[model samples]
Target: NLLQFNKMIKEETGKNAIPFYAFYGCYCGGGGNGKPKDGTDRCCFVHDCCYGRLVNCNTKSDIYSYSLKEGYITCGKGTNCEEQICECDRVAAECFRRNLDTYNNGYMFYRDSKCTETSEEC
Candidate 1:
């Protein structure tokens, strides 16, 4: 019923409907593995260096890199990780993101982070 209600709202508005996290948002929807959490607006890549969010890894200490494999994640290393194994440490283009968790205005929220700079080239 919750999914249906959210769907209905989207259809009625025709917009992405804001977001909970600012950077990564609810991406990772765990790669469809319930990747997005409750109240998340979009599905994104898993922000982990392990198995889940569909961003499987390759090696142990290594981040995403030039390699490939099937099964649970093995060498993931960041929020920019993709739905693959070799892409873990391979994305040097990634930037550092920070998480901002706090309470304000009688509200509590957990924010997401990412390495985006297309808008700033930073």
Candidate 2:
């Protein structure tokens, strides 16, 4: 039903639609510290070092999809979108991504942080 609704919207508007479902597993980073010296809350170091996956989809009547996962080192007191850290301790940051494929008529495990920039896959 939801997929049909998506198809209708895209056909009418001639636009591509992509929806992503993501989960973060084995997050070893710190939660949050106190305020930073720049008058901002100190971000968790472990939080910056994690990553996640993304699922891309087409708007056509048929379903076409691709998935990718990426992770980067982040700075303390910074958000996940901030510049990636070049080096950080490797903790088990097992983030995950999943998506449904219309062509396959099934769900698939699309992405994970294990395929990070630092990993051999990259």
Candidate 3:
């Protein structure tokens, strides 16, 4: 997944630079006021140019096993059916960490899945 993400970025930006940092975490599933519980494992990918900033983040989990009646991304039959949410990738989870500092610098921050503050950082 990381390699593919890098390949896509390079293909789009026309550069061979690798990401500067990467982090992964598990999602404990909360919020949205009384919704079903779910869990996820998420990954954040950062570019060298965007130090302390995430360029993209991806998540994978089985939250989709529940239901999407409340309007959320769902997995298809025979698929892993794990819910993945990414700020730039168009998935349905929230991102807790952010690069608010980059806003004024004319750059956007990549938001990934939310996790507990006590979660370990990679």
Candidate 4:
């Protein structure tokens, strides 16, 4: 998905689509203390960015098979959204693995999610 998007942009528009942003702390889709925590929270931040805001990239990408212990991304629907989001989830899952120490096992039960509520603008 990322490959296709970057390739089309480079071949057709002759411009690179990948860009970097300054660190904005951490936030994910679930509730927490509403503060930037550690590497686990950072994974959510990276995942959020991967699912870009300027565009609606989650319609297809958000549909997935996941649980606390395992997750899977389903793509190949032929839409750019599907293609783009699968990569986002892939990266986020990897990020979760690398930072598994910070997962706490308590983040999934919150009633309020700061990041999802505040920064979920498309």
Error of 4 at 41 (Å): 0.4
Model 2 TM-score is 0.16
**Please, what is the whole-model Cα lDDT of each candidate in the order they appear?**
0.27, 0.23, 0.25, 0.45
Report the C-alpha lDDT of model 1 over 1-122, residue by residue, as the tens digit.
12322232233333222332222233322222223332222222332323343434333332332222331223334444332433432221121111122212111122333322222110
Which parts of model 2 are misplaced by more than 4 Å? 19-122
Query: Looking at model 2, how many pairs of residues clash?
Result: 3
Arrange candidates, best TM-score first.
Answer: 4, 3, 1, 2
TM-score, candidate 3, is: 0.23
Off by over 4 Å in 1: 1-23, 27-50, 53-61, 64-84, 87-122
Instruction: Kindly report which residue stretches of model 3 are placed more than 4 angstroms away from their true locations once superposed.
Output: 17-122
Decoy 1 TM-score against native: 0.19
Predicted candidate 4 versus true structure: per-residue lDDT over 1-122, tens digit per residue: 34443333233223332321112233555222344455656665665566654276543324433222223333455455665665565665556556545554444433343334444322
Error of 4 at 25 (Å): 9.9
Over the stretch 11-107, how does candidate 3's per-residue lDDT look in tens digits? Answer: 3333322322122222211111111112212312222112223323322221223223333323333323122222222221211123212212111
Q: What's the distance in Å from true for residue 85, model 1?
A: 2.0
Question: Each candidate's TM vs. the true structure?
Answer: 0.19, 0.16, 0.23, 0.47
Residue 59, model 1, lDDT: 31
Q: Give the Cα RMSD of candidate 1.
A: 15.3
User: How well does candidate 1 score on lDDT at residue 58?
Assistant: 32
lDDT computed for candidate 2? 0.23
Off by over 4 Å in 4: 1-26, 30-35, 60-77, 105-122
